[PDB]
């Protein structure tokens, strides 16, 4: 496909640049970001793009609010080999003189640059354009520039061992690494980059199956379909935009922040027993501490979800328990103190003496058909042998209901559980 160029030197400076010493706080901050902080250095590409989005949205918003039309709202990257530069321009809202004089991920630029050169023109009516110059140490210069398009153009003059970010290939890799889901069109050297839609940001109402399937296949790198889907948004405990998938196939969740990738392989935002879940979690509250915060609410709502699933459909949950009950048992055993154990145990389903043999039941359901109070269960090789066990018959005219485990790990699980809400766990062999 033919090329889309919106990057050229249309800017000039007529007068002199006013030199300006940076505030004590902000130098310290600046080469904290440039020297101390980010592990990966590539992420500057990620942060600038992030800014490039924000501005753009606030352009759209304003315009859409005022009721006036929309210009070409795009993000562009260009790499120059001989000049050793990388440039990112966005046609979003701009920057007043004030803002310039006074996004912070921006400073990550100086991780890779020996000098940074910015041109910016506010979208505000009548706004003038400006040139901003810095070498990354306490001093920057500001001129009034002309031929600055509305939006912001950032030119990075790369360091020596940082010039790898001048090759279209490398930059392409970084871009598709952290930014397949950027909301506005993104071009590298004239060529469109991303195509994927952050459907997790949408209204759960508005995403249909075909999509959820697409995304499922992307983040799970799978070819089956999600047997289960949970689109969870919340603003109360923490900021969360997430989607969770349970595969058709029998036997990881990516962590994004504002449609931007933080960690693809992020197995700390969910309990180890919920590792069979696929999908995405997006939280603004993210740079191990808070991840704990997050993960806890994630676990509780996923438990909630599967409980609701048992109710909304019994048989499909039966197959789900057959294929994924391993993780639930393991997670019950692993859980440190009781409350969590019981919570996860609300997901277990087993046969009953009363129920027709095939039919299943949670401990919860067992506790209602009860008389006010104790559990009873039994590992036996099958139903036949179980309800023919003299221990069960012993339990004929005591008019008591007993659960049937047919595998040792089931009974070991019920044993470890010790008890479940105000009733205690005991086999009919004691
Ligand atoms: C000139 O350099 C900056 C200074 C000194 C402080 N913050 C920002 C980030 N930033 C603030 N508003 C921005 C908009 Cl509208 N767009 C972009 N891409 N970055 C912005 C930039 C780029």
52 lines ligand 1 (CB under 6 A): yes
Helices (H) and strands (E) in the chain, counts: 12, 21
**C-alpha span between 135 and 114 (Å, rounded):** 6
> What secondary structure does DSSP assign to 326-382, as a single string?
HHHHHHHHH-SSHHHHHHHHTT--EEESSS-BTBEE-HHHHTTSS------EEE-SS
Structural domain including 400 reads: 314-424
Q: Phi and psi of 55, rounded to 5°?
A: -45, -55
Task: Judge whether 203 is annotated as a binding position.
Answer: no
Which residue lies with its CA nearest to atom 3 of ligand 1? 100
Coil, strand or helix: which one is 262? strand
| Nearest Cα residue to 38 out of 136, 104, 116 | 104
117 lines ligand 1 (CB under 6 A): no
**Residue 263, CB-side half-sphere exposure with 13 Å CA sphere:** 14
Task: Judge whether 51 is annotated as a binding position.
Answer: yes
Contact call for residues 28 and 138 (beta carbons, < 8 A): no
103 lines ligand 1 (CB under 6 A): yes
Task: Judge whether 173 is annotated as a binding position.
Answer: no
123 lines ligand 1 (CB under 6 A): no
Distances (CA, A) of 88 to 120, 140, 190, 292, 413: 12, 20, 12, 36, 56
Q: Is the dihedral of CA 315, 299, 203, 197 positive or negative?
A: negative
Atom of ligand 1 nearest to the CA of 140: 5
Neighbours of 233 (CB within 10 A): 15
Contact call for residues 320 and 311 (beta carbons, < 8 A): no
Stated resolution in angstroms? 3.1
- Spell out a b/e string for 105-142, using b for 16 or more CB atoms within 10 Å of the CB, else e: bbbbbbbbbeebbbbbbbbeeebebbbbbbebebebbb
Coil, strand or helix: which one is 261? strand
Distances (CA, A) of 114 to 31, 32, 137, 155, 387: 12, 15, 10, 11, 79
131 lines ligand 1 (CB under 6 A): no
The CATH number for 347's domain is: 3.40.50.11260
Burial of 155 per CB tally in 10 Å (0-12, 13-18, 19+) = buried
Q: Are strands 186-188 and 75-80 parallel, antiparallel or unpaired?
A: parallel
Sequence-ordered list of residues with C-beta below 8 angstroms from that of 70, at least 6 positions apart, any chain: 60, 63, 64
Distances (CA, A) of 251 to 74, 118, 323, 345: 42, 52, 8, 21
**C-alpha span between 385 and 351 (Å, rounded):** 13
Q: Phi and psi of 71, rounded to 5°?
A: -85, 175
């Amino acid at each position: 496909e033919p090329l889309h160029s919106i990057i050229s030197s249309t800017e000039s400076v007529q007068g002199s640049t006013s030199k300006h010493e940076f505030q004590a706080e902000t130098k310290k901050l600046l080469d904290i970001v440039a020297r101390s902080l980010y592990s990966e250095k590539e992420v500057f590409i990620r942060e600038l793009i992030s800014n490039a989005s924000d501005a753009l949205e606030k352009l759209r918003h304003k315009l859409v609010s005022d009721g006036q039309a929309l210009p070409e709202m795009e993000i562009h990257l260009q790499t120059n080999a001989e000049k050793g530069t990388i440039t990112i321009q966005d046609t979003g809202i701009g920057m007043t003189q004030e803002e310039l004089v006074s996004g912070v991920g921006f400073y990550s630029a100086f991780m890779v640059a020996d000098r940074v050169e910015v041109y910016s023109r506010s979208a505000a009516p009548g706004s003038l354009g400006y040139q901003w110059l810095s070498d990354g140490s306490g001093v920057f210069e500001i001129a009034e520039a002309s031929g600055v398009r509305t939006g912001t153009k950032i030119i990075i003059h790369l360091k020596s061992d940082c010039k790898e970010f001048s090759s279209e290939a490398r930059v392409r890799d970084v871009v598709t690494k952290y930014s397949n889901f950027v909301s506005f069109p993104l071009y590298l050297n004239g060529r469109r980059m991303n195509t994927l839609q952050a459907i997790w940001m949408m209204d759960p109402k508005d995403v249909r199956e075909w999509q959820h399937e697409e995304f499922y296949r992307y983040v799970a790198q799978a070819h089956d379909k999600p047997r289960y889907t949970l689109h969870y948004k919340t603003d109360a405990p923490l900021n969360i935009r997430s989607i969770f998938y349970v595969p058709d196939m029998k036997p990881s969740v990516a962590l994004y922040s504002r449609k931007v990738l933080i960690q693809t392989k992020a197995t700390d935002i969910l309990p180890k027993w919920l590792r069979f879940i696929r999908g995405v979690v997006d939280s603004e509250d993210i740079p191990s501490a808070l991840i704990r915060k997050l993960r806890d609410v994630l676990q509780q709502r996923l438990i909630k979800f599967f409980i609701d699933q048992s109710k909304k459909d019994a048989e499909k949950y039966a197959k789900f328990f057959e294929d994924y009950g391993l993780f639930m048992r393991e997670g019950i055993v692993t859980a440190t103190e009781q409350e969590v154990k019981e919570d996860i145990a609300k997901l277990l389903r087993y046969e009953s003496s009363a129920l027709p043999s095939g039919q299943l039941t949670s401990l919860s359901e067992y506790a209602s058909r009860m008389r006010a109070r104790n559990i009873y269960y039994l590992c036996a090789p099958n139903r036949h042998l179980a309800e023919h066990s003299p221990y069960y018959e012993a339990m004929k005219k005591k008019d008591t209901e007993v659960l049937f485990c047919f595998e040792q790990f089931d009974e070991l699980t019920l044993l470890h559980l010790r008890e479940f809400d105000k009733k205690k766990l005991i086999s009919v062999e004691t």
